[PDB]
Write a protein that binds this ligand. Structure first.
Ligand SMILES: O=C(NCc1ccccc1)c1cccc(O[C@H]2O[C@H](CO)[C@H](O)[C@H](O)[C@H]2O)c1
Ligand SMILES: O=C(NCc1ccccc1)c1cccc(O[C@H]2O[C@H](CO)[C@H](O)[C@H](O)[C@H]2O)c1
Ligand SMILES: O=C(NCc1ccccc1)c1cccc(O[C@H]2O[C@H](CO)[C@H](O)[C@H](O)[C@H]2O)c1
Ligand SMILES: O=C(NCc1ccccc1)c1cccc(O[C@H]2O[C@H](CO)[C@H](O)[C@H](O)[C@H]2O)c1
Ligand SMILES: O=C(NCc1ccccc1)c1cccc(O[C@H]2O[C@H](CO)[C@H](O)[C@H](O)[C@H]2O)c1
Lengths: 103, 103, 103, 103, 103
């Protein structure tokens, strides 16, 4: 298996690493039908989403999508620095594939 | 693919944005049958609920409804200020569709 | 829907409101068979339970039962003041139907 | 229903109350196959387990076992003092049936 | 059952105990398809994973794998010192079977 977020990110097409090195600026969560999602933004001006579960997802990602939203919320509430995000850039806003935190 | 809570909220009928910019004053939770819900209030006097899950909800909303109630509880306990709420105004108290928070 | 704990409590028979206005003194949790329950006590001497899930509950209460024990646990740990409890008084100790907290 | 951990522990044979009055010294968690369990220790030298889910447990205990592991972890991390444990003494290490915390 | 992580770790082949005695330096989480995993690193240069769920896992490990990832996230966020890690050394990064922490 991969040893870092960049190596893992490099296995997927349509992705890029954003080096954030900052805590989350805003956290938005929706339970509106067909828009069950989370959106985060940074002072840098970037906006990112955890996509609504769909047909591009495989069954093993169900729990992982929910785990990623949980992580973003607690990270926001604890003011924890995000290091990097591995995102899919074929979506707007860019879609989170993975996150890393350090220190 | 909305990038803000206002863009998201505008995709639905019977919704309006409330700019709360304040922490939750009170948190109420019920496990009584047919009233499995959460009620929150603010010092402005405005009251909101997360609705009891029902026929108006699609199955993709089930985990999202549970997530929203989780978020309100930790938000209340941490004194986290809420920025905006997107709420369905055809229910009393108005019903939360989305929440945002910024730091 | 109800807008307050007292209005919601009043929809049910054999219930009453206890205005606690205090933090939980003690928290007990059991995973023993047929005693899968939580008991809270207050400095006042009053004791309440979240009952073991049984034939009196409906399917929609299953997750709400688990949420109320989740809430009491984090309320205890954070030493958060409870405002009111809506309880059924046809059980001993009285059984929790709803809780409210205010800051 | 029982009103205290000692009353509830008394409803079962092969149990005893250990009075702890202390925070957990060590927390151990395993996801190894057939050893999915948690072991806690105290500076007294006393050691307890949450057993691996199995044939000795009825269905209503499955979510309660997972809740006990969650309470041990958050209690460990917050340094919360444990009051009492009700344990089965026909297991080594003794097996947790219930826990209480006070103040 | 086992009373310590070393006992437990010794029941399996292809394992070893790493004495960490340190907080987690970095936490990485991926919801990317086929890489639904967590990776952690230490200032020692060691890197460990919670493997993606696969054919090597039995059903009882499903919830425990999700629990271990929950534990690594809250351990990271709180800067809780890990004592030991029991890992399978037939995977890269080495794969976590159990963790211990002491206060
Ligand atoms: O590139 C992919 N896989 C590469 C891979 C597979 C196996 C091993 C290693 C690498 C891959 C596979 C399935 C879907 C996929 O990507 C798609 O779905 C994603 C969510 O899962 C995002 O929504 C992306 O925007 C969408 O393009 C990307
Ligand atoms: O307006 C809606 N959808 C627009 C839409 C459709 C598809 C994608 C994005 C937006 C829509 C769809 C189903 C129900 C709905 O609204 C209804 O259900 C809500 C809970 O989900 C609330 O309880 C509202 O009070 C109730 O009026 C509103
Ligand atoms: O009084 C009730 N309902 C009024 C009501 C029904 C539906 C919607 C709103 C209000 C009602 C319905 C079913 C059980 C009930 O009460 C029963 O179950 C409770 C737990 O749910 C407690 O265990 C009470 O001790 C037991 O009497 C009380
Ligand atoms: O004593 C029990 N129930 C109380 C009771 C039973 C029967 C009559 C009266 C009271 C009881 C029931 C089922 C199992 C039980 O105990 C068993 O399983 C426990 C976990 O559930 C532990 O693993 C104990 O070590 C094991 O002996 C103890
Ligand atoms: O050696 C094993 N078990 C010994 C054992 C059995 C019963 C009780 C206690 C110990 C054992 C059993 C099943 C799988 C196993 O190991 C395998 O799966 C692991 C995850 O479960 C890791 O992925 C290891 O890398 C892979 O070899 C190792």
């Amino acid at each position: 298996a991969p040893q870092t977020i960049t190596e893992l990110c490099s296995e997927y097409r349509n992705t890029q690493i954003y080096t954030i090195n900052d805590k989350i600026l805003s956290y938005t969560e929706s339970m509106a039908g067909k828009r069950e999602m989370v959106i985060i933004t940074f002072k840098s001006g970037e906006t990112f989403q955890v996509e609504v579960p769909g047909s591009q997802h495989i069954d093993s990602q169900k729990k992982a999508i929910e785990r990623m939203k949980d992580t973003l919320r607690i990270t926001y509430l604890t003011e924890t620095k995000i290091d990097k995000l591995c995102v899919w850039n074929n979506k707007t806003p860019n879609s989170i594939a993975a996150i890393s935190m350090k220190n």
